[PDB]
Design a protein around this nucleic acid. Structure first.
Ligand SMILES: [Zn+2]
Ligand SMILES: [Zn+2]
Ligand SMILES: [Zn+2]
Lengths: 137, 263, 47, 113, 66, 49, 45
RNA sequence: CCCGGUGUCUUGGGUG
């Protein structure tokens, strides 16, 4: 019924193996004259409603570095937003998609048209053919 | 009672006829040589720097496929069976590679001949990169252009092909028997005339053809098995045939041990 | 427990010599997020 | 994510016996042998050898599922012989034939060297 | 991307024969004959060299980021 | 979930009552659901995706 | 503090939180984080 | 010192 048997040794030598890339984008938003979000590694003492994942792969600039393996729900971009009227900020960080893993490949840092900070994190992993994957002549 | 007649021979392939054995034994020998004859192969790559255009695990994947001299591998232990902490001189070979391109023009091709053995078992002829001649650069790994550098440390380990095909000491194994189909194990497809439409085996002249009026021998069994064992150079062809037999012996021996101990 | 999230090397077993990170350390059996394959293994503390 | 470790094909867990013999009491003198962490490679070799012995009346095997490296063999012998003993005999015969076979290859090899 | 180390189907090493194949084509040999000289007899091995496409020459033209 | 537990199995679109039958669960490696080949017909299932 | 790399001239330098996002050498406004200090291992499979 | 969760409305392309 239209399935197929594949030679496991062929897969081992590299048949139909492929790279997969995903990019995450984030930027700081403006809420007032001097009220801006800020990239940082958020301290648990000063920021409320933190995510459940690990923050231990972020460097001090709030950005993860290339070469580090990441798994689902790990934070890779730390960002906070202040709470209007210490203990004043709220987490606005971006976790890796729960179903994925791989290696951080490259991190772009720049500014956008409005002058605030702007980052992109590209993650790469390798997908190896397995039971259930689709093929066609 | 088993007899062998070697038709041709050289370093990396032996063509031979095997006779006075059962079909199952010829087949089990075929499978054992492909799957269970141990070899040595890279199994851990520590990348300290890779600024080439190839992805890290892409380069690492090619490294695993490089055939290494595995002649003395029988005295070496499996990593999973060694009593030591981490990795030592008795269960691994350490290899190192470092390449770089200076100059603003041209391309530096990184070849398998730049793999330098650093540490390994004492006086054992293992962990050496396979080479045809002495002026043969070997297998292409990567290519570098100005300011691109590749500096990696590789750990090679003993393994078998059941776990991953890179530990396979043989490529193809040609195998056939009964070139004139006297046993009638196949029923030939034809449009007009079966004999003219099917090509001859390359061993058709090693066995006489069936007499037109000859009666069907329902007691005849397969009895002559011609096979050619090609290798990748990780082991010499004579070693593969010998160690295939040896490995198959211990497996049967292990079964025999367990019956006389379970009572 | 000051052993969580610190980098670890495995010295016995089938995963001997591999890098990992301590993902969860409830008791005796650790969860290492091995760098190589994309999975978190259960492993005893002696290893 | 759900791929099993490939090394599980040949490495035996500590609580799992390499070999397990049970009786089939429904007929006289019949055993079921379960082989753990083994293949067609071993199984087909033993099977044909056993079938040419005059006192083996039934021998068969099946690999129940290729995703699990095991197989189960069924062996029945006539009243005189004990099946488990007959299996030992089949083993020793093949070890001998392969020892002979290894010897004759070595001799022929030096002549072509 | 770059020549595979092994033939996918049978495992014979073909990653050391790529340079030799390009040189033979400069001397005017036809593709079938060039493969014949390299002793790649089974057609599984022949597909590997005959149909590979060398994209790495294109990717290197992009100036190194670092 | 363990051996012999009954579960309800279902393949859209449910056009008739044999689109939902109870099977016994057998835990297995890999990431696909396995069906014995003779039940493909009532589900109008095949294995092309 | 944190190593960066200029997308145009490849000069390496560091930046803390306060400084503007540009290259000191050429003023290029696209920059990239340097490779992490930790060792990376792959199983070559 | 337990507990601990974050989105709504549309457009375009697929899968069966
Ligand atoms: Zn050791
Ligand atoms: Zn081939
Ligand atoms: Zn610059």
């Amino acid at each position: 019924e239209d399935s197929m048997i594949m030679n496991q040794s062929s897969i081992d030598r590299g048949l139909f193996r492929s790279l997969f890339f995903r990019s995450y984008m984030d930027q700081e938003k403006r809420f007032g004259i001097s009220i801006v979000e800020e990239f940082e590694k958020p301290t648990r003492a000063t920021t409320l409603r933190l995510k459940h994942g690990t923050y231990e792969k972020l460097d001090e600039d709030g950005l993860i570095a290339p070469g580090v393996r990441v798994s689902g729900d790990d934070i890779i971009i730390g960002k906070t937003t202040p709470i209007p009227p210490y203990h004043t900020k709220r987490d606005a960080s971006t976790p890796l998609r729960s179903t994925e893993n791989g290696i951080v490949d490259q991190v772009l840092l720049t500014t956008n048209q409005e002058g605030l900070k702007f980052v992109k994190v590209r993650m790469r992993t390798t997908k190896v053919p397995q039971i259930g994957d689709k093929f066609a002549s | 009672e088993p007899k062998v007649n070697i038709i041709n021979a050289q370093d990396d392939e032996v063509e031979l006829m095997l006779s006075d054995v059962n079909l199952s034994l010829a087949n089990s020998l075929r499978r054992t040589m492909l799957a269970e004859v141990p070899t040595l192969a890279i199994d851990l790559v520590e990348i300290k720097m890779n600024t080439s255009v190839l992805a890290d695990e892409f380069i690492s994947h090619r490294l695993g496929l490089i055939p290494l001299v595995s002649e003395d591998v029988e005295e070496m232990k499996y990593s999973r069976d060694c009593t030591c902490e981490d990795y030592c001189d008795e269960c691994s070979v350490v290899l190192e590679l470092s390449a770089r391109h200076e100059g603003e023009e041209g391309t530096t091709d990184v070849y398998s001949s730049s793999l330098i053995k650093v540490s390994g078992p004492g006086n054992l002829n293992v962990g050496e990169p396979v080479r045809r001649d002495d002026y043969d650069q070997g297998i292409l790994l990567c290519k570098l252009r100005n300011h691109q550098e590749l500096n990696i440390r590789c750990i090679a380990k003993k393994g078998i092909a059941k776990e991953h095909a890179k530990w396979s000491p043989c490529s193809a194994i040609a195998f056939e028997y009964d070139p004139h189909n006297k046993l009638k194990h196949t029923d030939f497809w034809f449009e007009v005339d079966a004999k003219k439409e099917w090509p001859d085996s390359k061993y058709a002249t090693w066995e006489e053809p069936p007499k037109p009026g000859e009666v069907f021998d329902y007691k005849a069994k397969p009895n002559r098995f011609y096979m050619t064992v090609e290798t990748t150079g990780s082991l010499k062809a004579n070693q593969v045939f010998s160690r295939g037999i040896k490995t198959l012996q211990e497996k049967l021996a292990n079964v025999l041990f367990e019956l006389e101990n379970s009572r | 427990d000051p052993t969580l999230n610190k980098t670890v090397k495995i010295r016995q077993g089938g995963y001997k010599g591999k890098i990992g990170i301590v993902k969860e350390a409830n008791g005796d059996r650790f969860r290492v997020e091995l760098h190589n394959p994309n999975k978190t293994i259960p492993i005893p503390c002696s290893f | 994510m759900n791929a099993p470790d490939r090394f599980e094909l040949f490495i035996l867990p500590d609580d799992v016996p390499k070999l397990k013999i049970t009786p089939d009491s429904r007929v006289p003198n019949c055993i079921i042998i379960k082989f753990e962490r083994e293949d067609h490679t071993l199984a087909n070799l033993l099977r044909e050898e056993l079938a040419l012995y005059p006192d083996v009346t039934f021998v068969a095997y099946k690999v129940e599922h290729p995703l699990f490296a095991n197989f189960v063999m069924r062996l029945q012998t006539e009243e005189g012989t004990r099946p488990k003993q007959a299996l030992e005999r089949a083993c020793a015969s093949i070890i001998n034939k392969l020892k002979t076979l290894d010897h004759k290859f070595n001799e022929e090899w030096n002549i072509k060297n | 991307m770059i020549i595979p180390v092994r033939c996918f189907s049978c495992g014979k090493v073909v990653g050391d024969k790529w340079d030799a194949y390009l040189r033979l084509l400069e001397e005017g040999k036809q593709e079938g004959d060039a493969l014949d000289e390299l002793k790649l007899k089974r057609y599984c091995c022949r597909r590997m060299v005959l149909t590979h496409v060398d994209l790495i020459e294109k990717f290197l033209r992009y100036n190194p980021l670092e | 979930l363990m051996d012999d537990d009954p579960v309800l199995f279902n393949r859209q679109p449910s056009l008739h009552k044999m689109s939902m039958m109870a099977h016994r669960v057998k835990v297995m490696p890999y990431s696909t659901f396995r069906l014995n080949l003779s039940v493909t017909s009532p589900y109008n299932a095949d294995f092309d995706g | 503090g944190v190593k960066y790399t200029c997308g145009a001239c490849a000069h390496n330098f560091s930046l803390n939180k306060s400084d503007p996002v540009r290259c000191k050498e050429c003023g290029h406004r696209v920059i990239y984080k340097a490779r992490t200090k930790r060792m990376i291992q792959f199983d070559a499979r």
